[PDB]
């Protein structure tokens, strides 16, 4: 099995448990990643409210940027498309730029419309702590702020 969270629409969100809302930020918010032993972090870059680029950081060393227009970067330099590397096989699956990390477990897609996506593995059950909400079957508690306080305003939790 595997959960799914997508930053679809225009500034919309769908947590791993179904809860959805709208948020047009500008600070490349943390989509997913455990809050105890991070070890990697999917970051959804944002520009002037629009969803621009989906970044993934491994630990603190490997940086990969996917962008919505197909361009890719290592953080400071451009790269070609297939770009197999240490995990993170960044390819084109069915016309959508797929970024697949299996050792850690996730799959990030960016279709033509720009709707992000993520498929976290079960081993992060109740462990992920990103903007896509903790991966617990309970969908009403998916606004856990980084401060550890469960809020109700989506924008507070997102920021």
């Amino acid at each position: 099995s595997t959960a799914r969270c997508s930053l679809f629409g225009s500034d919309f969100v769908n947590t791993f448990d179904g809860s959805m809302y709208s948020f047009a930020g500008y600070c490349s918010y943390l989509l997913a990643g455990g809050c105890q032993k991070r070890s990697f972090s999917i970051i959804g870059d944002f520009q002037n409210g629009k969803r621009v680029s989906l970044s993934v950081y491994l630990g603190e060393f490997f940086d990969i940027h996917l962008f919505v227009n197909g361009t890719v970067t290592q953080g400071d330099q451009r790269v070609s498309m297939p770009y197999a590397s240490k995990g993170l096989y960044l390819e084109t699956e069915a016309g959508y730029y797929k970024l697949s990390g299996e050792a850690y477990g996730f799959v990030a897609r960016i279709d033509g419309s720009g709707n992000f996506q993520v498929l976290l593995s079960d081993r992060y059950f109740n462990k992920t702590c990103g903007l896509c909400g903790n991966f617990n079957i309970f969908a009403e508690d998916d606004f856990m702020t980084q401060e550890g306080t469960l809020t109700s305003d989506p924008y507070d939790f997102a920021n």
């Binding site: 490349s28 809050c35 991070r38 972090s41 970051i43 970044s55 950081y57 630990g59 603190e60 940086d63 953080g75």
Partner: peptide, 9 residues
């Protein structure tokens, strides 16, 4: 800095 990898550089 692990919790915020973007700030490492």
């Amino acid at each position: 800095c692990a919790l915020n990898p973007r700030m490492t550089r």
